[PDB]
Design a binder for this molecule. Structure first.
Ligand code: NI
Length: 193
């Protein structure tokens, strides 16, 4: 989603990543996301809209180009969170990978469940829903990803700014959509950018 170097990442992929993150964040904000732990995820009071960020994409690229399925050292993406994903199909279209990745990360909520208490405890950390929680992390507003065609996998990395998943903190403030943001995108339930 725009103005980024021609570094091998497709603008269609950027577009899918941003669109999937926001639309998925919206659906959670609106109380329309199925929750594995029963019922749905609580509405969000001020779920922010994400923008694409090329600088963030760049550090995501640094992880992806290494073609090793591993979270980068927090050191190699200061201030930034990270989600990773692989498909066995190395040459699969990048935007298609973007889509599969986002679905698979978000899918943690319906598959593993989270609950009504959005505080990131040691407990909730254990359920292993950390890719979902980073996707809908309230204060995370910058998205940057890279999809690399490795020898033995199609390797997808997204990094997130500011980093989400701070232990002891809430994923998002609960409440009616738009209810705590200056300007709301009323149809989507996210604070406007
Ligand atoms: Ni992880």
């Amino acid at each position: 989603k725009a103005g980024c170097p021609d570094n091998g990442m497709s603008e269609e992929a950027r577009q899918k990543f941003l669109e999937m993150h926001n639309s998925l964040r919206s659906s959670v904000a609106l109380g329309q996301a199925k929750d594995g732990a029963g019922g749905n995820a609580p509405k969000a009071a001020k779920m922010k809209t994400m923008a694409y960020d090329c600088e963030v994409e760049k550090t995501a690229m640094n992880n992806a180009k290494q073609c090793v399925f591993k979270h980068s050292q927090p050191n190699q993406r200061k201030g930034l969170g990270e989600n990773i994903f692989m498909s066995s199909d190395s040459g699969m279209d990048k935007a298609k990978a973007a889509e599969q990745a986002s679905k698979a990360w978000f899918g943690e909520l319906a598959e593993k469940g989270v609950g009504q208490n959005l505080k990131l405890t040691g407990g909730l950390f254990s359920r292993g829903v950390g890719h979902y929680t980073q996707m809908v992390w309230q204060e995370t507003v910058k998205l940057g990803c890279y999809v690399e065609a490795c020898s033995n996998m199609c390797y997808v990395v997204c990094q997130y700014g500011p980093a989400g998943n701070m232990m002891g903190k809430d994923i998002y403030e609960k409440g009616e959509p738009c209810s705590k943001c200056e300007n709301c995108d009323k149809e989507k339930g996210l604070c406007s950018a």
